[PDB]
Amino acid sequence: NFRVQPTESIVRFPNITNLCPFDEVFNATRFASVYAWNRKRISNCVADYS
Amino acid sequence: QCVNLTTRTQLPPAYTNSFTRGVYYPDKVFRSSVLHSTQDLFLPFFSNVT
Amino acid sequence: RDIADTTDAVRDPQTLEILDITPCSFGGVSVITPGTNTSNQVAVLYQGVN
Ligand SMILES: *[C@@H]1O[C@H](CO)[C@@H](O)[C@H](O)[C@H]1NC(C)=O
Ligand SMILES: *[C@@H]1O[C@H](CO)[C@@H](O)[C@H](O)[C@H]1NC(C)=O
Ligand SMILES: *[C@@H]1O[C@H](CO)[C@@H](O)[C@H](O)[C@H]1NC(C)=O
Ligand SMILES: *[C@@H]1O[C@H](CO)[C@@H](O)[C@H](O)[C@H]1NC(C)=O
Ligand SMILES: *[C@@H]1O[C@H](CO)[C@@H](O)[C@H](O)[C@H]1NC(C)=O
Numbered sequence: 715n716f717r718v719q720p721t722e723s724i725v726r727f728p729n730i731t732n733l734c735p736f737d738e739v740f741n742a743t744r745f746a747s748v749y750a751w752n753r754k755r756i757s758n759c760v761a762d763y764s
Numbered sequence: 765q766c767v768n769l770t771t772r773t774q775l776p777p778a779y780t781n782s783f784t785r786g787v788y789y790p791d792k793v794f795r796s797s798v799l800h801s802t803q804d805l806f807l808p809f810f811s812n813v814t
Numbered sequence: 815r816d817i818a819d820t821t822d823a824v825r826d827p828q829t830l831e832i833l834d835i836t837p838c839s840f841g842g843v844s845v846i847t848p849g850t851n852t853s854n855q856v857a858v859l860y861q862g863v864n
Contacts, residue, residue, distance in 0.1 A: 715843060716842075718840065798815070
């Protein structure tokens, strides 16, 4: 029997959606204190760790 | 703030023969001229819709 | 999907176009031969392929 072997593998997924707000937590001009720390909960987005 | 509206005309709801309403798409797929048997959360025909 | 319940058409998630998936195009190999005492060459038939 003969089977046409694949040449390459392609991975296609939906476009980049709304980004997680890592710009606010990392590029803010004035951060908070140690005894008073602002706990920011981030969800419903893709987290770009690149 | 909360104000008592009152004027509660306490009447019972009625019943109606739901004939064919309540049929949705059970999955995210395309079928062309295909009679497909599914089993999912549905509303039966000729039901007692309130 | 189709009557046989297999994937045959997918939606491209970035550019909203509809492609169809015709299969891997395999087949069988049938060898047409005379006897080994009669001759030594064969003909190869590939089963039902373009
Ligand atoms: C509305 O009336 C009921 C009658 O018992 C009473 O219990 C309730 O407190 C009233 N609502 C308000 C907001 O006072
Ligand atoms: C449900 O609908 C049927 C059809 O009219 C009726 O005969 C039956 O009494 C209804 N059920 C109730 C509990 O009223
Ligand atoms: C995804 O990005 C491409 C650009 O490469 C664009 O043509 C396409 O319209 C985008 N998808 C959506 C749903 O906007
Ligand atoms: C080939 O020649 C003839 C014709 O088929 C046959 O009778 C003979 O036995 C064969 N010789 C072989 C297979 O060595
Ligand atoms: C292969 O498909 C093309 C497309 O029409 C057709 O012209 C050609 O005759 C086919 N060849 C065979 C061997 O089936």
